[PDB]
Amino acid sequence: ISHGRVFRRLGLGPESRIHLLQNLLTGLVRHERIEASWARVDELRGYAEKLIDYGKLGDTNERAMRMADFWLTEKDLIPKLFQVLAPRFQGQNGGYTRMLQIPNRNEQDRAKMAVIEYKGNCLPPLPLPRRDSNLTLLNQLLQGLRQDQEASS
Amino acid sequence: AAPKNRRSIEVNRCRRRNPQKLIKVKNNIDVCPECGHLKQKHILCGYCYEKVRKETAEIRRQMGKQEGGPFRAPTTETVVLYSGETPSEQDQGKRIIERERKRPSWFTQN
Amino acid sequence: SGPGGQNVNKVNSKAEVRFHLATAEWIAEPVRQKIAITHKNKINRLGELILTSESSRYQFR
RNA sequence: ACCAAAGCUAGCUCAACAUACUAAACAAAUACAAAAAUACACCAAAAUAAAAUAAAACAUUCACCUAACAUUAAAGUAUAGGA
RNA sequence: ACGAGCUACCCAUGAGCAGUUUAAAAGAACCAACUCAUCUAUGUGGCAAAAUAGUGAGAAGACUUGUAGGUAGAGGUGAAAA
RNA sequence: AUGUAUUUUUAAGAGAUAGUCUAAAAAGGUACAGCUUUUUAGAAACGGAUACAACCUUGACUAGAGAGUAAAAUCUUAAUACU
RNA sequence: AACAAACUCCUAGCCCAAUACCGGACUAAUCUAUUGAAACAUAGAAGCAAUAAUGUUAAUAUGAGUAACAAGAAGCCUUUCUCCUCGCACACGCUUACAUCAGUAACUAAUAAUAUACUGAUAAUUAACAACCAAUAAACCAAAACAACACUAAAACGUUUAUUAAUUACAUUGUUAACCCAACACAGGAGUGCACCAAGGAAAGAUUAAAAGAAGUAAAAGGAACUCGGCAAACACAAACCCCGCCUGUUUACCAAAAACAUCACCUCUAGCAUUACUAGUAUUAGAGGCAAUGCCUGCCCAGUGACACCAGUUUAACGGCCGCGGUAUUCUGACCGUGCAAAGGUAGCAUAAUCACUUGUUCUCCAAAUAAGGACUUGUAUGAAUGGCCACACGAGGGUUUUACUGUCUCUUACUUCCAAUCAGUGAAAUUAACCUUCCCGUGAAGAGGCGGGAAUAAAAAAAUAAGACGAGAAGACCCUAUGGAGCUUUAAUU
RNA sequence: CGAUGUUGGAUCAGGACACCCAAAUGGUGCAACCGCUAUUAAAGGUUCGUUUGUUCAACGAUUAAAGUCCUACGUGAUCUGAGUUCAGACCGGAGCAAUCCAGGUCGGUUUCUAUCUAUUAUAAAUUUCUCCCAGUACGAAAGGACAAGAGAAAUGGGACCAACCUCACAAACGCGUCUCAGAGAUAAUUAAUGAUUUAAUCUUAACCUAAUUAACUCAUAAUAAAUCCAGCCCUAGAACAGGGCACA
């Protein structure tokens, strides 16, 4: 019975799971885009979302200061977090990270792998799944429906 | 416990040829509109992702060559440009990476 | 109880004779009182006297 | 259709003859803890064969059982045997 | 015939026992290294043809242990468990 | 006597000598055993007693897509008024 | 009536069942002598025919793609983060498994990546550390333990003098390693000097978070009510009463660590002595033994069997034994007596015991309840005094009984993690197996049926669990009996 | 005997009735309550502790009751090992000794990865205790009812976290909370009507009869709209399945 559980079991326990997530978060903050197992990236998504929120509280906030000190193992990333990631995420509310499932690892384990990336980074854009153009048959019929609806009012 | 009798080939075939054990056909297979290679509808294209990953690896190698130390991370934003490009007014004041390769078609200025 | 292996394990060879003393008309009254006095440890509260045998291996013995 | 199956050869065995019987190689080192050139010693020795078995047990007995006299008969005879 | 390189006991040559209470190096006391293996749980074709974890006893002595040698089966050796 | 052809010796011989039930005559036990010990007879179907070792019918070869028979298939009552 | 056989007729025949044993006629496949040469005939020979020996060898199947095994994360590609701490060298031992380059389709890593563990080629360990590195006579009792000076158990470790010791660079050998013994790259076994990290490494291949299992943490009220036992666990880790052994210690490597053995102490016996034990010792000694410190003691007996005495006689701290029958004081008993046999007739002590059965002997304390425990009574007619009897301090992973404290032992379990478990990828065993197209009930039957009989049930295949059955698997029952089968041990067995 | 693993317990229990209670009755030396026997009825239960390895047995407190058996005197490929049933060691006895004990004491390895059969949740309650009935009927008084109706609980079935408690996850869990039923039918046993046997007689004589146990069936309750299923969540789940993805 695992009803109402949000945290999946990783590593050698709760503390090892926290340490693994901390290492993943440090790597994500340092490189602005990392890849891991799908479950690990899925769990790290929320922590990365909350880290930007904490950084948006300001540099002088002691709680956010100690949170960054604990999480960002490499101490040169804390100034980066508070002066690059936080300032560039100001008008955005919760659209800080993007997660996409990549093909399985070429190793024999054939793990389900995902890539997480902070938006607005200085990296080549991933092959995002783009929707069809409005000039398609179905979308053009839908545009006709929309035009009729607009003309009806 | 030990088996009582040897299981015949009829039983063995009926056991290990059941549709539950057979590999199911995947009907989410599609071709990538960009490169024409095969990909799944919910999974990013392997070819394009490999291109992006190699470009990212080269960019990161250059930006780490810029920083001679392990704990020397930029405190400002970063911008990468290719041969034949100049930083704009909105791109100045940031750390700059310069590449000898020309700008790829998929990589947009922005 | 005792060492007899499977024999003692699964053979009913312990004998027990239990009978009421007050209504036992086959024993004289003074004798009944004397037994009730001297062997009160072997008599329970319902007046039933109990004797048991375990020594012999045979049930009839 | 996989897994597979089939070759005829290497060679062995039993005898006979036979010179007469520990093959070849032995440059160096070889019983120092072998293949280790080189210092005052010790070197050496012999004393019955036994039993597993048979006698339906087992005590006396039980051929052959790592000692030349071979073959045809005498003869499985005289004898020796808890006879 | 071959076996004391494991083990039982000796023979030469060496090496170990930190800290604490004690006039004590007292076949004393607590507890380490170290040596044994009381109890339980796993293990039972296992890590292992006798182990792991927890927990236990001794821990300056009739103590452990390294090297070399000896006692060989009708026997050796044995603080007798045949 | 009669109906049948078997019996006795001669010369080679091996197996077996660790057995069950039924009917009958007895003994022991408990006038008990799918009990044990003696004597007479029988059996050990591919049919019957639903299944079945011993109970019954049956002088056991082969082919038939012929026939006649044998032992054998639901066993009996369930009843007591006397004003 | 009918239906109903290995019975009997009908139509043709090659014209009557069978275990052990017995007889006969043929015959499969080889070699040889003659025929034959699209593979046969007559004769003579045998290594002359396999559905069966828990048969031997080789390959294969079921169990089974099951149990089981591994690589910390990100990355700019070997750089940074998260954790645990058996590391360096020498001795012994293994021999190149060490280093560089190149390759891994396959072979080795229990899987990949690649490579200290596979393949090929080329190089290497350079002595000052270590091995080999004087004899012959004489002076020499006086410990090592910071050694001042002492104890008993009396203690390895050295110089000087005198005679000869080739005399003259550079000799020979071990120098790698991730390693040794355990069938394995095994959670095991391994001596010594240093420090507890300044050196070594990674518990997780990736997911989900079913049952059951192992490990850990926490728990309302109760606080041993669970159980053979307070085994395990616990915020406690204390005080006591008995049995057995005085105590430290040793023992059945691999089911028994003890109440067993040994032990200081006490007793016996056997020896008046010299060059290998005893012993380089001499009865206050040395062996063969018993019982166990200490305290109270060890009562009777040489009738039997041993030993000295070669016969008498002595020995029990030698092997061992220490009584009946009947009546009696005033009722229970018997101080006492008569008689008989003995070598003496069981003394002291203790006592329902670790002590045959009766036994849960009787009684008191402990508990609400006790075949438990302790204290008393005691013929125990089978207790008993060095095969030792009684108490006592200390002691004991020995065996029993209580008082609190303690707690998931339990009332009555629950929650969460890790290893497990299920899914994906890789590698991939074992016992077992006559063939199974492998149901339930009743009856039957070599006397407990999935296979028979009479009835019910019945699309076929997976995956995960529980173990009622397959008289389940494992070991030609270790209990019992037989074998004119063994072996150990003891003798009053028989030959010696 | 080329193995059918052997006592007590832990867990789970299947069945028989020769019934302990619970239910319906008959006779009583049954006035009433306690009682003693006899018939029918097996859907459900049949306690907690001390001593003993104990089955038994003795005792304490209760209960409506602490039933008798079969089941390899059930169940060790589920468990326990205290005793029995190996090898060690004592005490008493036998044997000169080795050894012997249904004579006692301590200690003493309990293996299995499931091949096949089999199986892996629909319900439609039960029983005690209090108030009246009533100190009423019944009785010389002491004593003392049945039935009917109101409630409290306990067991068991099925469920759930508003609060308490376990609880450092949003959940799970009990020690916490909610619910639990109508009709027919009968066995034993009572009377109406009525012949054989013009009386009577409940009838293996008919007709309709009425009071009637437990079971057992049935009303009733649950599921009960087929072919979209890539991906993402789930109070749904081993895998497979199942419910959601328009508000926001």
Ligand SMILES: Nc1nc2c(ncn2[C@@H]2O[C@H](COP(=O)(O)O)[C@@H](O)[C@H]2O)c(=O)[nH]1
């Ligand atoms: N002594 C003996 N034994 C026989 C006889 N017949 C058959 N047997 C035995 O019976 C057994 C076989 O039974 P059957 O096959 O005869 O039914 C075998 O032990 C066989 O020796 C006979 O006539 N005499």
Ligand SMILES: [Mg+2]
């Ligand atoms: Mg007993």
Ligand SMILES: [Mg+2]
């Ligand atoms: Mg015994």
Ligand SMILES: [Mg+2]
């Ligand atoms: Mg016995």
Ligand SMILES: [Mg+2]
């Ligand atoms: Mg019996």
Ligand SMILES: [Mg+2]
């Ligand atoms: Mg013989």
Ligand SMILES: [Mg+2]
């Ligand atoms: Mg013979």
Ligand SMILES: [Mg+2]
């Ligand atoms: Mg013999």
Ligand SMILES: [Mg+2]
């Ligand atoms: Mg001979």
Ligand SMILES: [Mg+2]
């Ligand atoms: Mg003569």
Ligand SMILES: [Mg+2]
């Ligand atoms: Mg030696």
Ligand SMILES: [Mg+2]
């Ligand atoms: Mg040695």
Ligand SMILES: [Mg+2]
């Ligand atoms: Mg010390």
Ligand SMILES: [Mg+2]
């Ligand atoms: Mg000490």
Ligand SMILES: [Mg+2]
């Ligand atoms: Mg251990």
Ligand SMILES: [Mg+2]
């Ligand atoms: Mg623990």
